[PDB]
Amino acid sequence: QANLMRLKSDLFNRSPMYPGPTKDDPLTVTLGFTLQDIVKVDSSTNEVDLVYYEQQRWKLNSLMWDPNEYGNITDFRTSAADIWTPDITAYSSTRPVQVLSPQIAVVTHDGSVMFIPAQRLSFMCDPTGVDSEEGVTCAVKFGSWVYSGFEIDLKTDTDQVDLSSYYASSKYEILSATQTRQVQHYSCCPEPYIDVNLVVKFRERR
Amino acid sequence: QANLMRLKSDLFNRSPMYPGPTKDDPLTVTLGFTLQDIVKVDSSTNEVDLVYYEQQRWKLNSLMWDPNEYGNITDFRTSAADIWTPDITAYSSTRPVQVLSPQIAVVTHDGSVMFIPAQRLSFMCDPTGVDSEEGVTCAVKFGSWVYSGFEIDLKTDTDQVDLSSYYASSKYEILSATQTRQVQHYSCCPEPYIDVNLVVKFRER
Amino acid sequence: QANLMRLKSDLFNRSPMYPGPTKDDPLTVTLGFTLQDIVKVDSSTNEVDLVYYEQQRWKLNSLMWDPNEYGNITDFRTSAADIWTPDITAYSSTRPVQVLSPQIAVVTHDGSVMFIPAQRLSFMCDPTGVDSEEGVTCAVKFGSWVYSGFEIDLKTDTDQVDLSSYYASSKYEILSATQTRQVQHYSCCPEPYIDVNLVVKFRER
Amino acid sequence: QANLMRLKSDLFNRSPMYPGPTKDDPLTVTLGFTLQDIVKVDSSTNEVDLVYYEQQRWKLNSLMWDPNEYGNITDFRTSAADIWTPDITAYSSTRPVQVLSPQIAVVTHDGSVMFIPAQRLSFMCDPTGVDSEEGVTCAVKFGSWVYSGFEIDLKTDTDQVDLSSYYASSKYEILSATQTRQVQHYSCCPEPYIDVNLVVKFRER
Amino acid sequence: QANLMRLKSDLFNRSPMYPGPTKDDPLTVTLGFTLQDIVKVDSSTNEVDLVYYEQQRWKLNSLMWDPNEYGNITDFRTSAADIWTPDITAYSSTRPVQVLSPQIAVVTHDGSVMFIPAQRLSFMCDPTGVDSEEGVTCAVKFGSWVYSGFEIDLKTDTDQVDLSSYYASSKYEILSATQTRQVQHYSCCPEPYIDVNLVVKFRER
Numbered sequence A: 001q002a003n004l005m006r007l008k009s010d011l012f013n014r015s016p017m018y019p020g021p022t023k024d025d026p027l028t029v030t031l032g033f034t035l036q037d038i039v040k041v042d043s044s045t046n047e048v049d050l051v052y053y054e055q056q057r058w059k060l061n062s063l064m065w066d067p068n069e070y071g072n073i074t075d076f077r078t079s080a081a082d083i084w085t086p087d088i089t090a091y092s093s094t095r096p097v098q099v100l101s102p103q104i105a106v107v108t109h110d111g112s113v114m115f116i117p118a119q120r121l122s123f124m125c126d127p128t129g130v131d132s133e134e135g136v137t138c139a140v141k142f143g144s145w146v147y148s149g150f151e152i153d154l155k156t157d158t159d160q161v162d163l164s165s166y167y168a169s170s171k172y173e174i175l176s177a178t179q180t181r182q183v184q185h186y187s188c189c190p191e192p193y194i195d196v197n198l199v200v201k202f203r204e205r206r
Numbered sequence B, C, D, E: 001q002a003n004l005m006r007l008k009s010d011l012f013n014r015s016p017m018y019p020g021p022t023k024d025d026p027l028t029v030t031l032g033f034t035l036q037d038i039v040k041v042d043s044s045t046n047e048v049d050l051v052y053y054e055q056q057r058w059k060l061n062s063l064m065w066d067p068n069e070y071g072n073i074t075d076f077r078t079s080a081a082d083i084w085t086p087d088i089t090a091y092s093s094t095r096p097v098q099v100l101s102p103q104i105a106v107v108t109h110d111g112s113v114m115f116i117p118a119q120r121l122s123f124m125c126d127p128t129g130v131d132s133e134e135g136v137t138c139a140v141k142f143g144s145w146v147y148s149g150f151e152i153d154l155k156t157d158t159d160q161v162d163l164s165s166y167y168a169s170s171k172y173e174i175l176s177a178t179q180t181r182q183v184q185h186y187s188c189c190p191e192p193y194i195d196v197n198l199v200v201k202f203r204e205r
């Protein structure tokens, strides 16, 4: 306990706050989704509710330490409020995202962070035909709201969404689920913005 | 990072807080909307729900810096709580506005700020006739709640609402969507208050 | 900018915080309502939902200043958290009040304040007969929760509720709307408590 | 203003906070409910929604002062954050409590406190037979969540619930309503816990 | 009062806060559930709502004291925000957990802690068949969200869920309710994570 107390004191109390990524010092956030459930569908408003967790990985030099100097500590769990986190935002959401898990990140000696918030999202999705064989396809872009590609780039480990925790007695079955890097442009800003497009094909069980 | 850390420290912690606009130092805020979706309509309460994001823009001398002095940093991203934001409020809302995006702005070396919050708004609107060819028109005014035209004026870069991000499989389609400056008066106060009137015509697809 | 920062620092940072009204130093608060909309009715729970804003006026010696000392500043806007605000509560509410506007007040050189929060309220009201010619009448008392008539007194500038911003295409029309000072006694306490009673008569249009 | 400012600073800023009651220094809290409305019933989930306020009363030596030393001030209103308050909880709630009033207590020179928060509670109650002449009976225990009888005891001035502010046009009329001290035991702990059982008889009118 | 004030000051004001467990200094948290009510069942979305409280227990050396040094004080109540608490999370929830009790822990002189928050939980569960005699079985895992078995182990004092405070007039009755330790692996991480699997069998009475 005593060695970790020193480490956290040395990293946070002394040091000034990391101001976020820049053009000169850009960052790459790795994103991956695990789908737990499609909970609800609203055919009158075209809203659909997903329950999932979103694995986020990035790396900062300012969070580095030498394990010999702090009793062989290679990593620690700390509150997400203590560190900077990327502003990863669903682009077609219809409600504020509901937080389902503790906001605690794992920081490792090399400066790499792992942060996995569990979320419930309501987003825009036409569910007409969900009760047929073909099913329906819906998409939602996840990316930084304010940082362009020149400050925050994104990537995935795999293009396949993790469905090994998907609820087996859900009212919907997943036919496919993919997560793909995209480049988009918007009216505000001349520079490109990056997102991870979550494309989920699904239908009712029988 | 080191030069930006300095810049943020020199702007916020070093200085006293900007008290907001006055009649002596008036401010002009540019507004623009991009309508993403008309999510819901309630014919029994005359409430309609919009999802959009609102491009806000203003300029303060107190947020200026010489980029030469801070490693050629022309601009930076920062939390909206670190700076003064204008109090742009919907005048015919029926619920608290639900925030859908990060509250983070972009500040540039000349003092100019850009801030684009995503919002869900429930507002007063009669949807009777939306299931027809002619459809229904509806309006909501966005302006400062507490500052008059002598302290905060508004303008638009375009009268046309950006519909390029409108949900293609929405239950309603937009026939027209405009954003226009207005001048209004209210009982409390003798001086004129300014707003941008968002007028949307729509029907069932 | 410079003289207003000074003024706010001299009023707020310098002084110890105003502890509120007392029997020795009492305070009168003027209330006026402007009704925007009767949004919803619920005949299964006897709840009705209003949307209004509520003009609150009062005056403190501790908020006085001389404009000649601070560059001829006669008034300013500031956050409601920077000052004491009266604890004006609806006595028959069924849900927590939903705030629809920024919490920013206006303060004038003579120590007077103006604060006008927009609110959505769910309150106790039986709407049985709203669909008839005669309509229904309902009432809600607005007053301090903890201060008596010896500390906080209330009055109205007019007994007529302002209906000039009422929603023209509402599901309900207003037949009458009044705001009247009352004196009430309660079981806890020996001393009288003051309220303004909002009485509204309405029907389906 | 000056004498109250001194008093509050001497009570609060001067001393370290009260750490709650102990076995050595026990504390008795007087509870009393005034029932305003039975708002809703759900026969499919057996939940019932009450709106009420709750008169809490206790006495601390550390809140004592001599009125001669502070300009004859016998009492004052102060924010409930500034003092310790008892953790009185409903033992069969099905939703978080919704706060309907400001959180302000009245403190008196002999160390006694009066705190009366207004609340909406959803709690467990089978409403089958509410549409008959006999109606239904439903109970809810109010007590400390963490303090036993050795640290917090309870009592009532009267066992008759205050119905003088009950809503006359409610969906349900109250036949009777009692509030009675009780001792209980739980699995965690060997020591007795105290509650006031709020028993309410009602029916549709 | 004076002796507890010293104790809390020596434990909390002096010390830097406990930084959670590590691989080199692991921690065992004992969990126990008491089910009060199955409030709601939703057969269209396969969500079910439980009301319960969750007895948590653990022991830190940093929370130890000698009772002879602080006037024979063997234990005390204090806010959960003053100390570290485990991040015990329901793994198959569909809404944010709703807190129904005060967040107050009981600390004892040997370093042991007892913390019993009451919660309402919406979790994934197919209720189809609940109206039969066989009923339905449903399960939810409770474990740390971020700490593995190397940092946080779990256990139970009994395999049986406490049903002695289960609501007698609930729409559903409990056929069996158990709480069992399990080991799991997840895609992120090579190391094993511990949970207590709450398995509840139930039907309509």
Ligand SMILES: *[C@@H]1O[C@H](CO)[C@@H](O)[C@H](O)[C@H]1NC(C)=O
Binding pocket: A071, A072
């Ligand atoms: C760290 O690891 C080394 C082995 O490389 C060992 O000698 C030492 O005792 C370990 N622990 C600490 C606290 O340094």
Ligand SMILES: *[C@@H]1O[C@H](CO)[C@@H](O)[C@H](O)[C@H]1NC(C)=O
Binding pocket: B071, B072
């Ligand atoms: C800033 O840019 C100028 C030329 O435009 C260059 O000479 C100077 O080295 C730059 N400064 C830094 C810190 O990179």
Ligand SMILES: *[C@@H]1O[C@H](CO)[C@@H](O)[C@H](O)[C@H]1NC(C)=O
Binding pocket: C071, C072
């Ligand atoms: C300020 O007000 C005084 C008194 O009305 C007036 O005579 C003077 O011109 C004003 N001066 C400035 C600097 O505004």
Ligand SMILES: *[C@@H]1O[C@H](CO)[C@@H](O)[C@H](O)[C@H]1NC(C)=O
Binding pocket: D071, D072
């Ligand atoms: C307090 O009240 C008494 C009444 O007997 C009065 O004579 C005295 O002047 C008062 N003192 C102060 C300080 O208010």
Ligand SMILES: *[C@@H]1O[C@H](CO)[C@@H](O)[C@H](O)[C@H]1NC(C)=O
Binding pocket: E071, E072
């Ligand atoms: C603690 O307990 C002992 C034995 O009962 C007693 O004699 C002593 O007075 C107690 N301590 C204090 C400070 O009262």
Ligand SMILES: CC(=O)C1=CCC[C@@H]2CC[C@H]1N2
Binding pocket: A145, A146, A147, A186, A188, A189, A193, B053, B106, B114, B115, B116, B117
């Ligand atoms: C700077 C900023 O907030 C934004 C930048 C571009 C990406 C999207 C659309 C508008 C908004 N978020």
Ligand SMILES: CC(=O)C1=CCC[C@@H]2CC[C@H]1N2
Binding pocket: B145, B146, B186, B188, B189, B193, C053, C106, C114, C115, C116
């Ligand atoms: C000063 C203030 O808050 C206001 C000024 C005028 C505009 C509207 C109506 C009343 C309120 N907001």
Ligand SMILES: CC(=O)C1=CCC[C@@H]2CC[C@H]1N2
Binding pocket: C145, C146, C147, C186, C188, C189, C193, D053, D106, D114, D115, D116
């Ligand atoms: C002091 C206090 O809180 C109160 C005073 C009287 C007015 C109403 C009823 C009881 C409560 N609020």
Ligand SMILES: CC(=O)C1=CCC[C@@H]2CC[C@H]1N2
Binding pocket: D145, D146, D186, D188, D189, D193, E053, E106, E114, E115, E116, E117
């Ligand atoms: C210590 C504590 O919080 C408790 C003590 C007994 C009373 C009820 C049931 C369990 C819990 N609240």
Ligand SMILES: CC(=O)C1=CCC[C@@H]2CC[C@H]1N2
Binding pocket: A053, A106, A114, A115, A116, E144, E145, E146, E186, E188, E189, E193
């Ligand atoms: C690192 C972290 O937060 C996690 C670790 C494993 C347990 C579950 C699944 C993923 C997430 N929570």
